[PDB]
Amino acid sequence: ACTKNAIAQTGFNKDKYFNGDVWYVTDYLDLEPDDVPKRYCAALAAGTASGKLKEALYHYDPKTQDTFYDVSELQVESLGKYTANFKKVDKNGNVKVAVTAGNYYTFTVMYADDSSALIHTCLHKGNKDLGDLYAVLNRNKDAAAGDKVKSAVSAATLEFSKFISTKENNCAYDNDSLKSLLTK
Numbered sequence: 001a002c003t004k005n006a007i008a009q010t011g012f013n014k015d016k017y018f019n020g021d022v023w024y025v026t027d028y029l030d031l032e033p034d035d036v037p038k039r040y041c042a043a044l045a046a047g048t049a050s051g052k053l054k055e056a057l058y059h060y061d062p063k064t065q066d067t068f069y070d071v072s073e074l075q076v077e078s079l080g081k082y083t084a085n086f087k088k089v090d091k092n093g094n095v096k097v098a099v100t101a102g103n104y105y106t107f108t109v110m111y112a113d114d115s116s117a118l119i120h121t122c123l124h125k126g127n128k129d130l131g132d133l134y135a136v137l138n139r140n141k142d143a144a145a146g147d148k149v150k151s152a153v154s155a156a157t158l159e160f161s162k163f164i165s166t167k168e169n170n171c172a173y174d175n176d177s178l179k180s181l182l183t184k
């Protein structure tokens, strides 16, 4: 189960974060660490599409090759904190699993600048038991975490040393499909 009420960035700039571009997960921390593999690839696009706040997600397990994309229209709880009922889609936006009740994640932007961010998520999916998952994001898939985002990790009373890097997994991303999925 999730246990954290993550605090959104003071002065969060929504239009900059939700600009239609891609964010790569470079490091992550699950508080129930067996919930996610030790090796992983994820990325997201975030933007407004025809007036609707959207995210598109990509997950890839570099060992098993399990792949999936998702799309959500985000609802606002407050500036920088969102709830997102998701649908599983192929890379072209064709629905594989429809939106339903009980399938949603919360999403809080704890820190962001133009190039890096720290988020918290809490996934709810059916009867699964999932925990708090923090992710360091960058606009450049290869960027080492800089001092601004690492300081934000400390300010959330977390230790960056505990985060697991995605950088040694040979992750390759389809940026084009993430951007187009925003419209779907």
Ligand code: FDE
Pocket (backbone or CB within 6 Å): 025, 028, 035, 036, 037, 040, 041, 042, 044, 057, 059, 068, 069, 070, 086, 087, 088, 097, 104, 105, 119, 121, 123, 125, 128, 133, 135
């Ligand atoms: C490492 C990592 C990282 C991440 C990130 C993320 C973010 C930022 C967000 C998210 C979300 C999500 N996820 Fe995530 N992630 C991960 C992981 C994961 C996994 C393993 C899974 C599967 C689960 C189950 O089903 O059990 C997921 C999962 C997930 C999901 C679901 C999808 C479907 O369709 O089913 C979602 C919605 N993810 N995510």
